[PDB]
């Protein structure tokens, strides 16, 4: 029950060594991939429903990406 938000302030960054640069992006990508691999049926269902009901490709892709990026973290 201890939540520590990430250090998003970047005013102090320069040309020196940084602590695990780009690690959070990799963590997010790995989380999404792991969630997708374990819910292939659900992912296919979401994609098929978006194809069926949404008539715009841009909205289709936005909805798919929102679902995939919003599922795993709020689990």
């Amino acid at each position: 029950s201890v939540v520590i938000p990430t250090h998003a302030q970047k005013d102090m960054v320069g040309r020196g060594h940084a602590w695990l640069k780009g690690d959070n992006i990799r963590d997010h990508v790995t989380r999404v991939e792991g969630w997708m691999w374990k819910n292939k049926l659900l992912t296919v269902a979401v994609v098929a429903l978006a194809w069926l009901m949404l008539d715009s490709w841009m909205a289709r892709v936005t909805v798919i990406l929102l679902a995939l990026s919003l599922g795993p973290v709020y689990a």
């Binding site: 939540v3 520590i4 990430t6 250090h7 302030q9 102090m12 020196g16 060594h17």
Partner: protein
């Protein structure tokens, strides 16, 4: 020379009549100044440090509970009390439990239960922070003239000079020897903001961890961990690291959430590192704006005669450096040691024209040194002459490639510095002033809006803004939102 030891390097070229040069010395880069009639010098920022800074709050990352106590009362007998409440370093909880005749209570219902436990922090589990003082922070700037001698990073240079800039120093005048004086005037107010900087360090020796981190005051001060002062003994918010389980009749379990150091390290991604040394707290990232005076510098070996043509040998044949320049060293065995090296270069098939941009002012072999030469050539096939010595050279690249590289370096300087980058190599032009003002305003607005927002949400916001611009019927709002989205996307990627 020294600039050659780093992959990051900047060249500032001064035309005749220039006597003051404005620079943004970044900690992690080197600057080479190449003027006419004057020697070249290397100016770089060594370190930013202070000895014995002040303290801030120190947190606890792993606790130690002891002397757990529980007191429960029957459903109607009244609320439960413990003296251990209202005592320092004691985490307590109040709850209700199901009682009855099975637990020797006269009535069935919910009874009051209270649990408490003492709180302590492990000896080496703390996150202490320190704050710099504007009046006591020190900047070290070192100057190294081009004497024609090369030395590796492990060898000390006797021609090198150092200068420390506190607010009491301001202006330091160095004596480079036979190359004259060099004036430096660094304003400390143009460096980092000491108010918004915290140098946090874990007290855990070894553990294969960095010495310290360079944080932001808001993030460090908004943490959900127990805290106190160095001199004090009583912790505050002791219940952040502890959890209480559901009551079971006349007993409730107290749990320790464990060591939160790993979570802290996970949340510090992308933060710059720092150092502590013995008592001096250093920084590895930063910058400072300085003015360099090139009026009192002298050139060594102008009246020297010319070295013999047929006495030059390759100690180190030319090789391609990391900055699109050429570096070589020679030996000379022709007596009359103090003399001037006859170095030049010509493109193949054009022997009447020289294409050499010497970085060393005028290479010269002295009695006990000399020989190193650094120079820049245009793309194509070239021929390098040092006296009668010849060496064919092929320089890769193109003019457009070099121009793209220069603009790329400028963009990187903007992304890493901000509005101070407009003061690099400045001559006080109006264009620089207007660019600096516009950058100040735009960055102020961008940081006010998206100050604490991450990369991905910023990119999504920019995409949404451009979509709103494209879809909006009104031409007035379309241009505004599309331009704002483009600005957001460009500034987020950098």
């Amino acid at each position: 020379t020294r600039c050659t030891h780093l992959e990051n390097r900047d060249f500032v070229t001064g035309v005749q009549g220039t006597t003051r040069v404005s620079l943004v010395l970044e900690l992690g880069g080197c600057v080479t100044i190449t003027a006419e009639g004057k020697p070249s010098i290397d100016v770089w920022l060594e370190d930013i440090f202070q000895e014995s800074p002040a303290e801030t709050r120190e947190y606890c990352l792993h606790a130690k509970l002891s002397n757990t106590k529980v007191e429960a009362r029957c459903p109607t007998t009244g609320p439960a009390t413990l003296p251990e409440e209202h005592q320092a370093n004691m985490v307590c909880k109040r709850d209700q439990s199901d009682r009855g005749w099975g637990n020797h209570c006269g009535f069935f219902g919910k009874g009051s239960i209270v649990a408490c436990a003492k709180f302590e922090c492990e000896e080496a589990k703390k996150a202490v922070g320190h704050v710099y003082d504007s009046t006591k922070i020190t900047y070290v700037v070192k100057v190294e003239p081009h004497t024609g001698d090369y030395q590796a990073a492990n060898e000390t240079n006797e021609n090198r000079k150092t200068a420390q800039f506190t607010v009491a120093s301001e202006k330091v005048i160095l004596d480079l020897g036979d190359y004259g004086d060099v004036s430096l005037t660094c304003k400390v107010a143009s460096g980092i903001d000491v108010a918004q900087t915290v140098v946090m360090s874990l007290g855990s020796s070894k553990d294969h961890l960095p010495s310290a981190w360079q944080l932001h005051r808001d993030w460090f001060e908004d943490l959900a961990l127990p805290w106190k002062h160095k001199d004090n003994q009583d912790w505050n918010s002791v219940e952040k690291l502890v959890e209480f389980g559901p009551p079971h009749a006349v007993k409730m379990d107290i749990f320790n959430l464990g060591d939160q150091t790993a979570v802290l390290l996970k949340s510090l991604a992308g933060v710059p590192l720092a150092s502590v040394d013995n008592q001096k707290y250093h920084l590895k990232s930063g910058h400072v704006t300085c003015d360099v005076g090139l009026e009192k510098l002298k050139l060594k070996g102008t009246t020297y005669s010319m070295c013999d043509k047929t006495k030059f040998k390759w100690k180190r044949v030319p090789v391609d450096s990391g900055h699109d320049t050429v570096v070589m060293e020679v030996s000379y065995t022709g007596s009359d040691k103090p003399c001037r090296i006859p170095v030049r270069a010509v493109a193949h098939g054009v022997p009447t024209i020289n294409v050499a941009m010497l970085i060393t002012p005028n290479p010269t072999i002295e009695t006990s040194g000399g020989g190193f030469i650094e120079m820049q050539l245009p793309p194509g096939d070239n021929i390098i002459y040092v006296g009668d010595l010849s060496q064919q050279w092929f320089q890769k690249g193109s003019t457009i490639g070099r121009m793209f590289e220069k603009t790329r370096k400028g963009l990187e300087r903007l992304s890493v510095v901000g509005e101070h980058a407009w003061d690099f190599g400045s001559v006080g032009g109006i264009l620089s002033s207007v660019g600096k003002a516009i950058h100040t305003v735009l960055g102020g607005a961008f940081n006010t809006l998206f100050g604490g927002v991450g990369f991905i949400p910023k990119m999504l916001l920019g995409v949404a803004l451009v979509w709103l611009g494209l879809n909006a019927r009104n031409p007035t709002m379309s241009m505004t939102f599309l331009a704002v989205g483009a600005l957001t996307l460009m500034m987020t990627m950098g």
